[PDB]
Amino acid sequence: WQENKSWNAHFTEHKSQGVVVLWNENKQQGFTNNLKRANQAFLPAGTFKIPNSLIALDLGVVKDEHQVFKWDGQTRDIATWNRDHNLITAMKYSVVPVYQEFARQIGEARMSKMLHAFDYGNEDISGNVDSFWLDGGIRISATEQISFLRKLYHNKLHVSERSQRIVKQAMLTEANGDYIIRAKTGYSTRIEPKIGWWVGWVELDDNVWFFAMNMDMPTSDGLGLRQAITKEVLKQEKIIP
Amino acid sequence: WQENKSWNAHFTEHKSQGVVVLWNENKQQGFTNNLKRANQAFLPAGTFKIPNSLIALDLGVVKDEHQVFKWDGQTRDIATWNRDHNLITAMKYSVVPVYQEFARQIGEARMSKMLHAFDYGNEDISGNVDSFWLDGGIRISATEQISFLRKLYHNKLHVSERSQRIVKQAMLTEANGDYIIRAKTGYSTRIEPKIGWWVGWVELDDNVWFFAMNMDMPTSDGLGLRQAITKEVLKQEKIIP
């Protein structure tokens, strides 16, 4: 592991503070701007939609990525939640009420066993079964996100290969002739400190770079800086153009 | 089906000639600028990499999309061919020699049987087992490409679901917050008429639009008009921004 404090410029330029953790898969080498915050664990919030999707798929509570999840009819703050969704759009728009249905269906016993199978963070599901990744006991660090994502990438998590392929498809965020990004955002607000997540990887022709970032996020108005700052680190390191 | 020569307008702007065929999956409605040319069958050339990939995976000729096809050591006229590849980069760079090896390992009996199971065009593999899609008897139309791609999208082809998912992964061309394009190019030169292909689909939040286009390509510096003209059609019909 190697610390590169020059990435802090990208945080300072935007009156922000956080961590970016990169992992070069071919070279088995890690880079971060803050080794200690790289290993600090937070609530995963929306990034928990990755393991939650894996478990729901594996147990059959979600049949596939085409299955339609009917809006429960309750109007909520976020406009894109007040409609039908499938797994692709539930991930894309981070639709909490859908994933809370999953968790309630999965249940505490199976959720706990699956998080141990995944070595997911501190593997603690204490709290409400339908909200523990937002205000319960589960905590995961940026480096632990990468360890989790590396196993997902190689289909080595303890669920079906099909489940892992469907979720990696649902993580599709961006793709062009130079790279593919599969990733998931999160915004943890129910328990201080308010932080924003972006975790995933960028696939190149010849390599895979895993990334996990979090930053202090007192207001939702800075949420776009998660991707902006990450991408500026990726550009500085010549990973993307 | 609906004819729409308003799109011809975009073939004149570049004084090229061809056909674009769109299929609205939700509405079950087809659209084309040239009803007659939509049903004209051509050599598939590089678009055959889709069914060839499916068959090689289903039969175990390709274990997965990480498996490395080592360069045979013959320097060819296309620099990206002169290196190692996996399924992802083989598709991306239309690496013909890689797919020739697949075809030889598949054999002409199993290939024939699979193309019948696929309803792939005229289902005729006459010619060399390792080049018939470039200079043999196989012929497929733009509308027949759509029928084939619709089956692949829904995992309804007579191969494992896993094979179809891997191939759809490998078809990934472009993705942003508005759409996802999975597609494959092709350039048929060995037999007249010289035509270029682009076939695939556009995934939206609430719909998928299948497309298949071909056009006269006397020389290969007009190749970029395959994607350029197709998008002009998609932008006109408000499918993509």
UniProtKB/Swiss-Prot annotation, chains A, B:
The alphabetical list of record keywords is:
Antibiotic resistance, Hydrolase, Plasmid, Signal
Q: What is the phylogenetic placement of the source species in the record? A: Bacteria, Pseudomonadati, Pseudomonadota, Gammaproteobacteria, Enterobacterales
Q: What does the record give as EC number?
A: 3.5.2.6
**Which species is this record about?**
Klebsiella pneumoniae
What's the name of the protein? Beta-lactamase OXA-48
Describe the processing and modification events after translation.
Carboxylated on the epsilon-amino group of a lysine, with the resulting carbamate functional group serving as a general base. Probably N-carboxylated at Lys-49 at neutral pH in vivo and undergoes complete N-decarboxylation, at pH 4.1, in vitro.
Where N6-carboxylysine occurs along the chain?
A: K49
Gene Ontology cellular-component annotations:
plasma membrane
GO function terms (MF aspect): beta-lactamase activity; penicillin binding
Q: Which PROSITE patterns match?
A: BETA_LACTAMASE_D (PS00337)
Report if keyword Signal is assigned: yes
